[PDB]
Amino acid sequence: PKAKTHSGASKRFRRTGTGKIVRQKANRRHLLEHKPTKRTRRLDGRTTVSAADNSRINKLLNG
Amino acid sequence: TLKVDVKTPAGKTDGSVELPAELFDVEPNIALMHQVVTAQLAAKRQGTHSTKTRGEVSGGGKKPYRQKGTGRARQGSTRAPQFTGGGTVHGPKPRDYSQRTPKKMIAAALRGALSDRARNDRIHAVTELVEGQTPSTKSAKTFLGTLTENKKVLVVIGRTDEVGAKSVRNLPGVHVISPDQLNTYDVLNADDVVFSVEALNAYISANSK
Amino acid sequence: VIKLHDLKPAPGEKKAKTRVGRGEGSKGKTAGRGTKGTKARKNVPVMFEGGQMPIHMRLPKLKGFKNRFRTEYQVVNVGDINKAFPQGGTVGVDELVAKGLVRKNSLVKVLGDGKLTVKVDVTANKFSGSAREAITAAGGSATEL
Amino acid sequence: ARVKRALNAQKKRRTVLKASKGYRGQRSRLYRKAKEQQLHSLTYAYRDRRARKGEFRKLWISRINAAARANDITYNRLIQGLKAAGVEVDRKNLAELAVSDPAAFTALVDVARAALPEDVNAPS
RNA sequence: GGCAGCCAACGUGUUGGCUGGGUAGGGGAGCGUCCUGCAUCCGGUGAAGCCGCCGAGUGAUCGAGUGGUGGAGGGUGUGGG
RNA sequence: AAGUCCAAGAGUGCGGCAGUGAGACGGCGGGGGAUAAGCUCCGUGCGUCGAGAGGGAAACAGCCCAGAUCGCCGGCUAAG
RNA sequence: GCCGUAGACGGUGAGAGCCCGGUACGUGAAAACCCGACGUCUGUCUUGAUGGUGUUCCCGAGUAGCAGCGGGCCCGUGGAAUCUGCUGUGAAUCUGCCGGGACCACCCGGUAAGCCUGAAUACUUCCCAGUGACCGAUAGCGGAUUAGUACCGUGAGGGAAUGGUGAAAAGUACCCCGGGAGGGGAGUGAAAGAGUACCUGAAACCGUGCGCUUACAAUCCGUCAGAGCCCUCGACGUGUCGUGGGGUGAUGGCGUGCCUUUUGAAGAAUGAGCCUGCGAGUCAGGGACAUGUCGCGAGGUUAACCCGGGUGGGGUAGCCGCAGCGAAAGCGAGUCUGAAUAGGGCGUAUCCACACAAGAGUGUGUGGUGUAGUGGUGUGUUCUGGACCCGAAGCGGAGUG
């Protein structure tokens, strides 16, 4: 039997050209009125998955 | 390019064959040859061994007695592994042992084996094993005795030559094979590799074309 | 002469299997599991973090869609063409796959990375601006399929 | 390949049971009880190999003190005097002299007494 | 006085300096059992097994050292499971 | 700025494999309690037991001395 | 010495090509059946084909389509296409109708509501011939022995244990003790330390004989010192020492079982009467990650399948590597955001030298050196599977009372 990739992990995480695993930041979907624009601007884009989650994220992505 | 002289059953020398360097002068590779021969034996082995686990042992579908009160150990089936007559926990099951070694590895191992044979001067070319149309183990034995005095000899004979196959078939240490089916295990098993001339040219043409 | 009993594995090839739970000398009575618990008996799923919202559920899904009508190209740079064709000449997809530069039956786009110093007649599905200029400057034609 | 454990098992069983000969009761007949007693016996042997040196030294000191007091000197003063006179004889051979050569022991007592200070309680 | 681990020095393996309690656990190297490819040796002038003696190794253990009993198969080296 | 430096077998980064996530008592600083508990909750480049044998405390995990590679029918000491 | 197209495998008084059944290789069918071939026989075409020109009729009906409620599709009702069940409603015959993931237009494909069809594929109750880095009597089928038997249950149903004398019975004539059983002589046999209680014959357990020790003594049953007695190996005299070895041990010091599980157990916590057998990290997959080792190497490699009495030879379809950035269109050693040559994110393997700038941490440019993956296989983890082994109360389906 082949190994199945985790669907949520696949939809949440991507990889870069060298192998960095990349995620998105939270607290941005709604309730945006009282959030200042400075805090809103640090919450978008992508960030590298922290070294603690690297192993589990790789496991979920590969199999 | 080492030479090999052709002999005849009559005892005379017919001609010479030129063994290509790319086939008979490669450097032996012990680890590669060991891997290939081990893979060959693994493919040879048949794994028709089996045991019945706790599931396929007959009976034993009922709890033998109550969980509590009897003063004995808890048992859930009379066929549990710890029972006499119970199933086997991690026992043999039929399995396929053959592995997928690359063709380049296989061919290089065969080249190394035949190259070692050539280097130690153990390759013989023969126009024909016995005089045609009737098998004769006596004639074949005499000719092979004049050829090599070693115990185990491989004979590489074409598919259509029945007289030589039937003639050397019964000799104890002799193994008869086709030029198409040359393999590292057989080559290393033999002390001497006795080629028929047509088998030699067929092998050389097939591998160099 | 090499016989069948002279065949040995390469040094460091084979490593002795770890047989576990075979006495207190090596790995006894627990087999490297420690005392009781969950891991003492079965396993723990990877996507499980003890009860709190797992890492794959508390982050937003990556934005966007996939666009299954995407036209994907296999790319080759002018530097590789320069290295592989010292004598110049016509360069099409057939010889680009012959010299092992792109896949066999794909779409080829040519990119201008290296330096081109030979006369070459390139034919491809698509060309980049830099690649086309670099090919033209060396007196070659960038014929587009 | 089904393997029978008989040969491998009886090897160690015979070894332990032979090593446990002369024990009393179940400890010389039964493999498990013999194994337990073997654990204890080897622990005791290892401990007493260390403690035997001290026990023999205690015996030697007792004999040396007995003979020294027969020569009208105490053990501590005799040892201090022998240390001062530079005599390097150890307690085993001192006890051997005491039991076997009383005259030689008396000579050593006299040497120690001569090398002792005039007043042993003086602050120097 | 004997052994082992790490490191250094000099050389085609010796010397020296430090170090060597240990549960969960990690790492390295090994003994014994069976079945096998290949090569060798022993065996009704007595194999295996079992019971002893006399010994041996740092350990699991060993005795191509020897007696008794027994009556037909084993040992060794190097690989495979 | 030095020291240790044929070692602490030290720090830091990444990776393979873990176990642990019930602690105890003793010394100092505290809370709760009656400034009781062999009580309970914290702090401590504090210690020991846990996972630590040997000597002393009569016996006596946690106190004092001291960290067991092996042998010796050698010597000097620690607490006592 | 001989045979060998025969040196496969078994038996025969111990390892047999030449003693036997056989083996290689050839021969054999009255009858029955199964295959083919040629015929009688049957059918069909021959009152028959062709290439052309312009109009009406026909081309599968309670069907398609639509609606309601469902099923199944990667698709869990979602914008829900295609297929399909029940209930209603219900069309046209070719400028017709159905499909191209709601729908509409255009182009494309096809011609539903009639029916038959081999091969490639799946399985073995049964029959024949073989094979095993499968088991060898607590194993292997439950069943090598009376086996679905004995026994248990009202019933459905559950369900065992029990192999080996010897080469040949040559299975102990006869005598003695004994009511017999059993034995002692005598015989058979190479062996009766093979006597139908029978190959070998271990441990627990139970005796008999001999040596030392033990009835003033508080013993986790040992250990370290150790008198005495006894037995051996040597040298020497009449019994006395040694580089000795063994067996017992009067007496002295020291000394709180094993395992689990615990802060902590000799614990008055748990488990174990004893011995002998058996009883727990295994296997599958081009699976995932890491690390050895081997082949090739900017390439590596085949899957199904085809041909070989084999482990060998072919097979380029695919997969991985070779360019990245972006939600995407797209652009590309750059790219995205952005009005920005204005900063930032990601990327251009990595190093060295040289210039230009800056000391807001260094950046930007020119040169070189140049980039390492992939396929087998060992090991450690991991995924899906009963997944290291044992253990509930209970839950479903079908039956028996």
CSV table of all heavy atoms in Angstrom, one decimal, chain D residues 20-63:
chain,number,residue,atom,x,y,z
D,20,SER,N,27.0,-24.9,41.9
D,20,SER,CA,26.3,-24.9,43.2
D,20,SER,C,26.3,-26.2,43.9
D,20,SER,O,25.4,-26.4,44.7
D,20,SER,CB,24.8,-24.4,42.9
D,20,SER,OG,24.8,-23.2,42.1
D,21,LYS,N,27.3,-27.0,43.8
D,21,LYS,CA,27.4,-28.2,44.5
D,21,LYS,C,27.7,-28.1,45.9
D,21,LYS,O,28.6,-27.2,46.3
D,21,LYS,CB,28.4,-29.2,43.8
D,21,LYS,CG,27.8,-30.2,43.0
D,21,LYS,CD,28.8,-31.0,42.2
D,21,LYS,CE,28.2,-32.1,41.3
D,21,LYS,NZ,27.6,-33.2,42.1
D,22,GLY,N,27.1,-28.8,46.8
D,22,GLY,CA,27.3,-28.7,48.2
D,22,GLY,C,26.4,-27.8,49.0
D,22,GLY,O,26.6,-27.7,50.2
D,23,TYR,N,25.6,-27.1,48.3
D,23,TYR,CA,24.6,-26.2,48.9
D,23,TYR,C,23.5,-27.1,49.6
D,23,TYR,O,23.3,-28.3,49.3
D,23,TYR,CB,24.0,-25.2,48.0
D,23,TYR,CG,24.9,-24.2,47.5
D,23,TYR,CD1,24.5,-23.2,46.6
D,23,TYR,CD2,26.2,-24.1,48.0
D,23,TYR,CE1,25.3,-22.2,46.2
D,23,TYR,CE2,27.0,-23.1,47.5
D,23,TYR,CZ,26.6,-22.1,46.6
D,23,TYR,OH,27.4,-21.1,46.2
D,24,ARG,N,22.8,-26.5,50.5
D,24,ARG,CA,21.8,-27.2,51.4
D,24,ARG,C,20.4,-27.0,50.9
D,24,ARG,O,20.0,-25.8,50.8
D,24,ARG,CB,22.0,-26.7,52.8
D,24,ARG,CG,21.6,-27.8,53.8
D,24,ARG,CD,21.8,-27.2,55.2
D,24,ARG,NE,20.7,-27.7,56.1
D,24,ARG,CZ,20.7,-28.7,56.9
D,24,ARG,NH1,21.8,-29.4,57.1
D,24,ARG,NH2,19.7,-29.0,57.7
D,25,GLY,N,19.7,-28.1,50.7
D,25,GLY,CA,18.3,-28.0,50.4
D,25,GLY,C,18.0,-27.9,48.9
D,25,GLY,O,18.6,-28.6,48.1
D,26,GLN,N,17.1,-26.9,48.5
D,26,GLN,CA,16.8,-26.7,47.1
D,26,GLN,C,17.9,-26.0,46.4
D,26,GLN,O,17.9,-26.0,45.2
D,26,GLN,CB,15.5,-25.9,47.0
D,26,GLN,CG,14.2,-26.6,47.1
D,26,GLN,CD,13.0,-25.8,46.8
D,26,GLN,OE1,13.2,-24.6,46.5
D,26,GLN,NE2,11.9,-26.4,46.7
D,27,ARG,N,18.9,-25.4,47.1
D,27,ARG,CA,19.9,-24.5,46.5
D,27,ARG,C,20.9,-25.4,45.7
D,27,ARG,O,21.7,-24.8,45.0
D,27,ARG,CB,20.6,-23.6,47.5
D,27,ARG,CG,19.7,-23.1,48.5
D,27,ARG,CD,20.3,-22.0,49.3
D,27,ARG,NE,19.5,-21.5,50.3
D,27,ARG,CZ,18.5,-20.5,50.1
D,27,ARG,NH1,18.3,-20.0,49.0
D,27,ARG,NH2,17.8,-20.1,51.2
D,28,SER,N,20.9,-26.7,45.9
D,28,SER,CA,21.9,-27.5,45.2
D,28,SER,C,21.2,-28.5,44.2
D,28,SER,O,21.9,-29.3,43.5
D,28,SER,CB,22.7,-28.4,46.2
D,28,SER,OG,21.9,-29.2,46.9
D,29,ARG,N,19.9,-28.5,44.1
D,29,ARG,CA,19.1,-29.4,43.2
D,29,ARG,C,18.4,-28.7,42.1
D,29,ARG,O,18.2,-29.2,41.0
D,29,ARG,CB,18.1,-30.2,44.0
D,29,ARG,CG,18.8,-31.1,45.1
D,29,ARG,CD,17.7,-31.5,46.0
D,29,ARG,NE,18.2,-32.6,46.9
D,29,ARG,CZ,18.8,-32.3,48.1
D,29,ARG,NH1,19.0,-31.1,48.5
D,29,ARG,NH2,19.3,-33.4,48.7
D,30,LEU,N,17.9,-27.5,42.3
D,30,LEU,CA,17.0,-26.8,41.4
D,30,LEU,C,17.7,-25.6,40.8
D,30,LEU,O,18.3,-24.8,41.4
D,30,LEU,CB,15.7,-26.3,42.2
D,30,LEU,CG,14.6,-27.3,42.3
D,30,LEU,CD1,15.0,-28.7,42.6
D,30,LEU,CD2,13.7,-26.8,43.4
D,31,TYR,N,17.5,-25.5,39.4
D,31,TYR,CA,18.3,-24.5,38.7
D,31,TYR,C,18.0,-23.1,39.1
D,31,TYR,O,18.9,-22.3,39.3
D,31,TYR,CB,18.1,-24.7,37.2
D,31,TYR,CG,18.6,-23.5,36.4
D,31,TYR,CD1,20.0,-23.2,36.4
D,31,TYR,CD2,17.8,-22.7,35.7
D,31,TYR,CE1,20.5,-22.2,35.7
D,31,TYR,CE2,18.3,-21.6,35.0
D,31,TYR,CZ,19.7,-21.4,35.0
D,31,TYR,OH,20.2,-20.3,34.3
D,32,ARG,N,16.7,-22.7,39.3
D,32,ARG,CA,16.4,-21.4,39.7
D,32,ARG,C,16.9,-21.0,41.1
D,32,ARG,O,17.5,-19.9,41.2
D,32,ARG,CB,14.9,-21.2,39.6
D,32,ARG,CG,14.3,-21.9,38.4
D,32,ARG,CD,13.0,-21.1,38.0
D,32,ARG,NE,11.9,-21.6,38.7
D,32,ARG,CZ,10.9,-20.8,39.2
D,32,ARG,NH1,11.0,-19.5,39.1
D,32,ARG,NH2,9.9,-21.3,39.9
D,33,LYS,N,16.7,-21.8,42.1
D,33,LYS,CA,17.1,-21.5,43.4
D,33,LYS,C,18.7,-21.5,43.4
D,33,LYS,O,19.3,-20.7,44.1
D,33,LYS,CB,16.6,-22.5,44.4
D,33,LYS,CG,15.1,-22.8,44.2
D,33,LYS,CD,14.3,-21.6,44.3
D,33,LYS,CE,12.9,-21.7,43.6
D,33,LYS,NZ,11.9,-22.4,44.4
D,34,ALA,N,19.3,-22.4,42.7
D,34,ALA,CA,20.8,-22.4,42.6
D,34,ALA,C,21.2,-21.1,42.0
D,34,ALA,O,22.3,-20.5,42.4
D,34,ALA,CB,21.3,-23.6,41.8
D,35,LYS,N,20.5,-20.6,41.0
D,35,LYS,CA,20.9,-19.3,40.3
D,35,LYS,C,20.8,-18.2,41.3
D,35,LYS,O,21.7,-17.3,41.4
D,35,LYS,CB,20.0,-19.1,39.1
D,35,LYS,CG,20.6,-18.1,38.1
D,35,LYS,CD,19.7,-18.0,36.9
D,35,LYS,CE,19.0,-16.7,36.8
D,35,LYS,NZ,19.8,-15.6,36.5
D,36,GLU,N,19.8,-18.1,42.1
D,36,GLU,CA,19.7,-17.0,43.1
D,36,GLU,C,20.8,-17.1,44.1
D,36,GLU,O,21.5,-16.1,44.4
D,36,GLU,CB,18.3,-17.1,43.8
D,36,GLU,CG,17.1,-16.8,43.0
D,36,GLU,CD,15.8,-17.1,43.7
D,36,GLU,OE1,15.7,-16.7,44.9
D,36,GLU,OE2,14.9,-17.7,43.1
D,37,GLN,N,21.1,-18.3,44.6
D,37,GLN,CA,22.1,-18.5,45.6
D,37,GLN,C,23.5,-18.2,44.9
D,37,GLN,O,24.4,-17.8,45.6
D,37,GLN,CB,22.1,-19.9,46.2
D,37,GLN,CG,22.9,-20.0,47.5
D,37,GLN,CD,22.7,-18.7,48.3
D,37,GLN,OE1,21.5,-18.5,48.8
D,37,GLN,NE2,23.7,-17.9,48.5
D,38,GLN,N,23.6,-18.4,43.6
D,38,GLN,CA,24.9,-18.1,43.0
D,38,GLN,C,25.1,-16.6,42.9
D,38,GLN,O,26.2,-16.1,43.1
D,38,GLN,CB,24.9,-18.7,41.6
D,38,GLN,CG,25.4,-20.1,41.5
D,38,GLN,CD,26.5,-20.4,42.5
D,38,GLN,OE1,26.4,-21.2,43.4
D,38,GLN,NE2,27.6,-19.7,42.2
D,39,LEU,N,24.0,-15.8,42.6
D,39,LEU,CA,24.1,-14.4,42.7
D,39,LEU,C,24.6,-13.9,44.0
D,39,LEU,O,25.6,-13.2,44.1
D,39,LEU,CB,22.7,-13.8,42.4
D,39,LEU,CG,22.1,-13.9,41.0
D,39,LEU,CD1,20.7,-13.6,41.0
D,39,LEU,CD2,22.8,-12.9,40.1
D,40,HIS,N,24.0,-14.4,45.1
D,40,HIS,CA,24.4,-14.0,46.4
D,40,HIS,C,25.8,-14.5,46.7
D,40,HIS,O,26.6,-13.7,47.3
D,40,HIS,CB,23.4,-14.6,47.5
D,40,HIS,CG,22.1,-13.9,47.4
D,40,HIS,ND1,21.9,-12.6,47.7
D,40,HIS,CD2,20.8,-14.4,47.2
D,40,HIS,CE1,20.6,-12.3,47.6
D,40,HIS,NE2,20.0,-13.3,47.3
D,41,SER,N,26.2,-15.7,46.3
D,41,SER,CA,27.5,-16.2,46.7
D,41,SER,C,28.6,-15.4,46.0
D,41,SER,O,29.6,-15.1,46.6
D,41,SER,CB,27.6,-17.7,46.3
D,41,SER,OG,26.5,-18.4,46.6
D,42,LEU,N,28.4,-15.0,44.7
D,42,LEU,CA,29.5,-14.3,44.1
D,42,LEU,C,29.5,-12.8,44.6
D,42,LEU,O,30.6,-12.3,44.7
D,42,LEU,CB,29.2,-14.3,42.6
D,42,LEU,CG,29.5,-15.6,41.9
D,42,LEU,CD1,29.9,-15.5,40.5
D,42,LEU,CD2,30.7,-16.3,42.7
D,43,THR,N,28.4,-12.3,45.0
D,43,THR,CA,28.4,-11.0,45.7
D,43,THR,C,29.2,-11.0,47.0
D,43,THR,O,30.1,-10.2,47.2
D,43,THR,CB,27.0,-10.5,45.9
D,43,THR,OG1,26.5,-9.9,44.7
D,43,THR,CG2,27.0,-9.5,47.0
D,44,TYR,N,29.0,-12.1,47.8
D,44,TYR,CA,29.7,-12.2,49.0
D,44,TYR,C,31.2,-12.4,48.8
D,44,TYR,O,32.0,-11.9,49.5
D,44,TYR,CB,29.1,-13.4,49.8
D,44,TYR,CG,27.8,-13.2,50.4
D,44,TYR,CD1,27.0,-14.2,50.8
D,44,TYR,CD2,27.3,-11.9,50.6
D,44,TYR,CE1,25.8,-14.0,51.3
D,44,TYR,CE2,26.1,-11.7,51.2
D,44,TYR,CZ,25.3,-12.7,51.5
D,44,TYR,OH,24.1,-12.5,52.1
D,45,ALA,N,31.5,-13.2,47.8
D,45,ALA,CA,32.9,-13.5,47.5
D,45,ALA,C,33.6,-12.2,47.1
D,45,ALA,O,34.7,-11.9,47.6
D,45,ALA,CB,33.1,-14.5,46.4
D,46,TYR,N,33.0,-11.4,46.3
D,46,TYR,CA,33.6,-10.1,45.9
D,46,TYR,C,33.8,-9.2,47.1
D,46,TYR,O,34.8,-8.5,47.2
D,46,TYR,CB,32.7,-9.4,44.8
D,46,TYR,CG,33.2,-8.1,44.3
D,46,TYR,CD1,34.1,-8.0,43.3
D,46,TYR,CD2,32.7,-6.9,44.9
D,46,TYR,CE1,34.6,-6.8,42.9
D,46,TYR,CE2,33.1,-5.7,44.4
D,46,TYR,CZ,34.1,-5.6,43.5
D,46,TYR,OH,34.5,-4.4,43.0
D,47,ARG,N,32.8,-9.1,48.0
D,47,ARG,CA,32.9,-8.3,49.1
D,47,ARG,C,34.0,-8.8,50.1
D,47,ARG,O,34.7,-8.0,50.6
D,47,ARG,CB,31.5,-8.2,49.8
D,47,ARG,CG,31.6,-7.7,51.3
D,47,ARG,CD,30.4,-8.3,52.1
D,47,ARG,NE,30.7,-9.6,52.7
D,47,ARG,CZ,29.9,-10.3,53.4
D,47,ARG,NH1,28.7,-9.8,53.7
D,47,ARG,NH2,30.3,-11.5,53.8
D,48,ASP,N,34.0,-10.1,50.3
D,48,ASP,CA,35.0,-10.6,51.3
D,48,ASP,C,36.4,-10.6,50.7
D,48,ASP,O,37.4,-10.6,51.5
D,48,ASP,CB,34.6,-12.0,51.7
D,48,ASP,CG,33.3,-12.0,52.5
D,48,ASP,OD1,33.1,-11.2,53.4
D,48,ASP,OD2,32.4,-12.8,52.1
D,49,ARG,N,36.6,-10.6,49.4
D,49,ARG,CA,37.9,-10.4,48.9
D,49,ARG,C,38.5,-9.1,49.2
D,49,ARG,O,39.7,-8.9,49.5
D,49,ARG,CB,38.0,-10.6,47.4
D,49,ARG,CG,38.2,-12.1,46.9
D,49,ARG,CD,38.5,-12.2,45.5
D,49,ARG,NE,37.4,-11.7,44.7
D,49,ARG,CZ,36.4,-12.4,44.1
D,49,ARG,NH1,36.3,-13.7,44.4
D,49,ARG,NH2,35.5,-11.8,43.4
D,50,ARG,N,37.7,-8.0,49.3
D,50,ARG,CA,38.1,-6.7,49.7
D,50,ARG,C,38.3,-6.7,51.2
D,50,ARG,O,39.3,-6.2,51.7
D,50,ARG,CB,37.1,-5.6,49.4
D,50,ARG,CG,36.8,-5.5,47.9
D,50,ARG,CD,38.0,-5.0,47.2
D,50,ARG,NE,37.8,-5.1,45.7
D,50,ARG,CZ,37.2,-4.2,45.0
D,50,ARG,NH1,36.8,-3.0,45.5
D,50,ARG,NH2,37.1,-4.4,43.7
D,51,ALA,N,37.4,-7.3,52.0
D,51,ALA,CA,37.4,-7.2,53.4
D,51,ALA,C,38.5,-8.1,54.1
D,51,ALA,O,38.8,-8.0,55.3
D,51,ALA,CB,36.0,-7.5,54.0
D,52,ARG,N,39.0,-9.1,53.3
D,52,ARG,CA,39.9,-10.1,53.9
D,52,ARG,C,41.2,-9.4,54.2
D,52,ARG,O,41.9,-9.8,55.2
D,52,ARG,CB,40.1,-11.2,52.9
D,52,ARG,CG,41.1,-12.2,53.3
D,52,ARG,CD,41.8,-12.8,52.1
D,52,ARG,NE,40.9,-13.5,51.2
D,52,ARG,CZ,41.1,-13.5,49.9
D,52,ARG,NH1,42.2,-13.0,49.3
D,52,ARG,NH2,40.2,-14.2,49.1
D,53,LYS,N,41.7,-8.4,53.4
D,53,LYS,CA,42.9,-7.7,53.7
D,53,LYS,C,42.8,-7.0,55.1
D,53,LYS,O,43.7,-7.1,55.9
D,53,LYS,CB,43.2,-6.8,52.6
D,53,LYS,CG,43.4,-7.4,51.3
D,53,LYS,CD,42.6,-6.7,50.2
D,53,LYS,CE,42.8,-7.4,48.8
D,53,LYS,NZ,42.3,-8.8,48.8
D,54,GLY,N,41.7,-6.3,55.3
D,54,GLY,CA,41.5,-5.7,56.6
D,54,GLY,C,41.4,-6.6,57.7
D,54,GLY,O,41.9,-6.4,58.8
D,55,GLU,N,40.7,-7.8,57.5
D,55,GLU,CA,40.6,-8.7,58.6
D,55,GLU,C,41.9,-9.3,59.0
D,55,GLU,O,42.2,-9.4,60.2
D,55,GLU,CB,39.6,-9.9,58.2
D,55,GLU,CG,38.2,-9.7,58.7
D,55,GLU,CD,37.2,-10.6,58.0
D,55,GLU,OE1,37.6,-11.7,57.5
D,55,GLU,OE2,36.0,-10.2,57.9
D,56,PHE,N,42.8,-9.6,58.0
D,56,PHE,CA,44.1,-10.1,58.3
D,56,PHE,C,44.9,-9.1,59.0
D,56,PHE,O,45.7,-9.4,59.9
D,56,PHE,CB,44.8,-10.7,57.1
D,56,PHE,CG,44.6,-12.1,56.8
D,56,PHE,CD1,43.7,-12.6,55.8
D,56,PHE,CD2,45.2,-13.1,57.7
D,56,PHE,CE1,43.5,-13.9,55.7
D,56,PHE,CE2,45.0,-14.4,57.5
D,56,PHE,CZ,44.1,-14.8,56.5
D,57,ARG,N,44.8,-7.8,58.6
D,57,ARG,CA,45.6,-6.8,59.2
D,57,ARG,C,45.1,-6.6,60.7
D,57,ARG,O,45.9,-6.4,61.6
D,57,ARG,CB,45.4,-5.4,58.5
D,57,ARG,CG,46.2,-4.3,59.1
D,57,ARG,CD,46.4,-3.2,58.2
D,57,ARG,NE,46.6,-1.9,58.9
D,57,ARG,CZ,47.6,-1.1,58.7
D,57,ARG,NH1,48.6,-1.4,57.9
D,57,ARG,NH2,47.6,0.0,59.4
D,58,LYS,N,43.8,-6.8,61.0
D,58,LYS,CA,43.3,-6.7,62.3
D,58,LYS,C,43.9,-7.8,63.2
D,58,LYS,O,44.4,-7.6,64.3
D,58,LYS,CB,41.8,-6.8,62.3
D,58,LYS,CG,41.2,-7.3,63.6
D,58,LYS,CD,39.7,-7.4,63.5
D,58,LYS,CE,39.0,-6.2,64.0
D,58,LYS,NZ,37.5,-6.4,64.1
D,59,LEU,N,44.0,-9.0,62.6
D,59,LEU,CA,44.6,-10.1,63.3
D,59,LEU,C,46.1,-9.9,63.6
D,59,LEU,O,46.6,-10.1,64.7
D,59,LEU,CB,44.5,-11.4,62.5
D,59,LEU,CG,45.3,-12.6,62.9
D,59,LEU,CD1,44.6,-13.2,64.2
D,59,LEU,CD2,45.3,-13.6,61.8
D,60,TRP,N,46.8,-9.3,62.6
D,60,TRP,CA,48.2,-9.0,62.8
D,60,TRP,C,48.4,-8.0,63.9
D,60,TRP,O,49.3,-8.1,64.7
D,60,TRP,CB,48.8,-8.5,61.5
D,60,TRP,CG,48.9,-9.5,60.5
D,60,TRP,CD1,48.9,-10.9,60.6
D,60,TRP,CD2,48.8,-9.3,59.1
D,60,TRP,NE1,48.9,-11.5,59.4
D,60,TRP,CE2,48.8,-10.5,58.4
D,60,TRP,CE3,48.7,-8.1,58.3
D,60,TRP,CZ2,48.8,-10.7,57.1
D,60,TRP,CZ3,48.7,-8.3,56.9
D,60,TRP,CH2,48.7,-9.5,56.3
D,61,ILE,N,47.6,-6.9,63.9
D,61,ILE,CA,47.7,-5.9,64.9
D,61,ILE,C,47.4,-6.5,66.3
D,61,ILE,O,48.1,-6.1,67.3
D,61,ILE,CB,46.7,-4.7,64.6
D,61,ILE,CG1,47.2,-4.0,63.3
D,61,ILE,CG2,46.7,-3.8,65.7
D,61,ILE,CD1,46.4,-2.8,63.0
D,62,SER,N,46.4,-7.4,66.4
D,62,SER,CA,46.2,-8.0,67.7
D,62,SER,C,47.4,-8.8,68.2
D,62,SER,O,47.8,-8.6,69.4
D,62,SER,CB,45.0,-8.9,67.6
D,62,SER,OG,43.8,-8.2,68.0
D,63,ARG,N,48.0,-9.6,67.3
D,63,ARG,CA,49.2,-10.3,67.8
D,63,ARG,C,50.4,-9.4,68.1
D,63,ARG,O,51.1,-9.7,69.1
D,63,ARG,CB,49.6,-11.3,66.7
D,63,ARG,CG,48.5,-12.3,66.4
D,63,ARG,CD,49.0,-13.4,65.5
D,63,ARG,NE,48.0,-14.6,65.5
D,63,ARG,CZ,48.0,-15.5,64.6
D,63,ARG,NH1,48.8,-15.5,63.6
D,63,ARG,NH2,47.1,-16.5,64.7
